[PDB]
Design a protein around this ligand. Sequence first.
Ligand code: FES
Length: 106
Amino acid sequence: SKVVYVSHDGTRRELDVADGVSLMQAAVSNGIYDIVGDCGGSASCATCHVYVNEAFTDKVPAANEREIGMLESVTAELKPNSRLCCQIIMTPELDGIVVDVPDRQW
Ligand code: FES
């Protein structure tokens, strides 16, 4: 399924992500350098921060308590649509999802 990672300067990078793969994993294994994913996807670091386009924030599972706590420590601006993309699992239902990546993770 399609996922578009828009870098902070506007570059739209599209990837085909298989079902069950997190957006963080697909990102770090396909050159999306603006996403670090340091902890490996256990909602333990804040380095996979992205802004989910509002047309999809409702189709994606709500952030659990751990993510909510971790998001408080994001280094870039924290927005209402901020999410740790390691917590977003790709599914056909999300095909076309767009996420904007901040200018910093650390
Ligand atoms: S990869 Fe660490 S919180 Fe997402």
